Every structure is written in structure tokens, then in C-alpha cells.
Amino acid sequence: PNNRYSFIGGRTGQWQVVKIRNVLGPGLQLVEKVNILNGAVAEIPLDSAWRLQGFASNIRYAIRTELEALQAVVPMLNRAEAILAVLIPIKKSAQWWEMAQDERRDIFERESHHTAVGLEYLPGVARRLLHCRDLGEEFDFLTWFEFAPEHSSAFNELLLRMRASKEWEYVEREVEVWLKRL
């Protein structure tokens, strides 16, 4: 449908905030709930603390054989069992964005094995990647993960592996918003 998603932190919404972890750089204000809208929001209610937005876009790095591997195991969003979610806004450094395409692909997969590592956690973890640097937002990406509680430990292990990678040496802001489906 609409390629735009808005995440409004405040007092209403479909998701309850469990905790907010300020991984790197300035964090996000603590709020009660997150309201997720499949569209752009002009202004947020007075009782909202922040608004995040991003759009779904085309593939930027993954190659055909990687997409085939993902498609064989990828789970759908909105599984009945997937009552936990994590929203992770990420900003990468200017030095990352000034690099050419071969340099960034080399770091993303040849050195960091982003997709190969991520594949190990499917189909337990469902995901949605949104882009927002081109919208002028404070973050460059909004990443969304959801899973049943049984996979919480596996997801924490994934996070540890990702943040140890060469790719994460270019991450300059990151926040984790942990959520429970209402």
C-alpha cells in the first residue's frame, strides 16, 4: 500500500513500551506506548513525545542468491505468537555515506556477513527495514523485529554479533525501544 510508516511515542498505540535502551548517542524520551501508522503524519498529538518515520524501499545490497536464501525461511509479520517487538533506529556516519557502492557492500557482507548472520535467526525473527535518511530524519534507518518470547535470548545473541561487526564501526546513533503487543 503506502510505503511510509510512522512511529509515534506517547500515550496511545498498539504496542506497550517495555524499556528504552540508549545504545549510542542521544536517546529517546521514555513513553507509555508506540502508535504505528502506515502513512505520513503531519503533526503529532500534544501528549506525544516523538515521531519517527521511514519508508519501505528497494534492495540496496543483497544479491540474488542471498534473497533466495531469505525467501526460503522468512516469516511473516503479525504472527499470532510474535507478541514481542524491538524498534531500533540507527544512524550511520558521514564517512559511511561518502563511500562508493562497492566499499559499502564489502563492509556490509564481505566483512560483516550481515545477511549470513541474520539468516541464522529466521524464521524465529520477523523483520521490517525502513529508510529515512532521504526524508531528513534524525536517524537513517528504522529497523523492526518481532518474535515470540521463546526467541528473546536468540535475538539478544544476534544483537551482540551485529554490534561487533565492522559495519557497526560506522553506526553513530542507536536506540532500542522494546515493545509488547497489546
Interface size with ligand HEM, residues (CB under 6 A): 22
Are the CB atoms for 141 and 127 separated by under 8 Å? no
DSSP state at residue 66 = H
Instruction: Tell me: is residue 110 an annotated ligand-binding position.
Output: no
Nearest Cα residue to 88 out of 42, 60, 130: 130
Instruction: Tell me: is residue 92 an annotated ligand-binding position.
Output: yes
Among the listed residues 51, 91, 114, 131, the single contact to a copy of itself using CB under 8 A:
131
| Residue 159: contacted member of a copy of itself, ligand HEM, ligand O=N[O-], none (CB under 5 to 8 Å, by partner type) | ligand HEM
Are the CB atoms for 20 and 28 separated by under 8 Å? yes
Among the listed residues 122, 135, 152, 178, the single contact to ligand HEM using CB under 6 A:
122
Are the CB atoms for 146 and 85 separated by under 8 Å? yes
Instruction: Tell me: is residue 131 an annotated ligand-binding position.
Output: no
Is residue 130 involved in binding ligand HEM (CB under 6 A)? no
Among the listed residues 23, 27, 49, 55, the single contact to a copy of itself using CB under 8 A:
55
Q: Which three cell numbers stand for residue 165?
A: 561487526
59-66 contacts: CB < 8 A, separation 24 or more? 61/104, 61/105, 61/108, 61/109, 61/114, 61/115, 62/115, 66/109, 66/115, 66/116
Among the listed residues 33, 105, 127, 163, the single contact to a copy of itself using CB under 8 A:
105
In angstroms, what is the minimal distance from the CB of 24 to ligand HEM?
11
Is residue 159 involved in binding ligand HEM (CB under 6 A)? yes
User: What residue ranges bind ligand O=N[O-] (CB under 6 A)?
Assistant: 127-129, 143
